[PDB]
Amino acid sequence: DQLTEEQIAEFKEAFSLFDKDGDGTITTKELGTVMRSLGQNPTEAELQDMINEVDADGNGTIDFPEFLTMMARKMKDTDSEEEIREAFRVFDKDGNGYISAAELRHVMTNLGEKLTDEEVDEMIREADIDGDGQVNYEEFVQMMTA
Amino acid sequence: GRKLELTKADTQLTKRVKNAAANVLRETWLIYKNTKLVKKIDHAKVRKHQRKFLQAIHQLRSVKMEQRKLNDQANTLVDLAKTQLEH
């Protein structure tokens, strides 16, 4: 419900991440492109619902003041520790709270966007606190989110 | 900065809610009446109202899941906009 001067300028830059063809408005078509660029697949009705929840004048598009207004309502952030721990748990084959340094390389060099073997070495150096070649991922996530 | 933190968590959907919620009230009443306020339980009647009851309850669950989906799509866009606060 309250925004600073610095935040208004930064949210102007954010508006450009959404206004793809640069005409000062966000359409359902532009919103669909941005959402798909984030690996999401909103339906036509979901895109129209997102436009309609923030479009006050009912012209079917989002302008900068409507965009800024909705940002004010959701400024509150929360820690992501539990969610990140749940992403590590996907790779905990035996559900014992550990992922070996070998399994971490196997996952990080083959799945998603990937890390190089050298980047994996830097991550394991930090993650493997005990130097036992095993990562207690609850502890590692707690360290990163501290 | 924000580091690893993220944003803290329509006439058509409203219409779906009101009709389904009225149907939950209708069917809860009719199952109650046909199981507790009758001298002889008619099982064909109970089966019919149980089918209408489950369909209304599951319609309300479907709307609630759709509202949670819409809310996370909105949180995704707010999270993307908040990346520009990193300066």
Ligand SMILES: Nc1nc2ccc(OC(F)(F)F)cc2s1
């Ligand atoms: N209830 C809602 N809050 C928001 C906040 C931001 C938003 O992104 C957009 F880019 F459309 F502005 C959509 C919505 S729908």
Ligand SMILES: [Ca+2]
């Ligand atoms: Ca535009």
Ligand SMILES: [Ca+2]
């Ligand atoms: Ca508008």
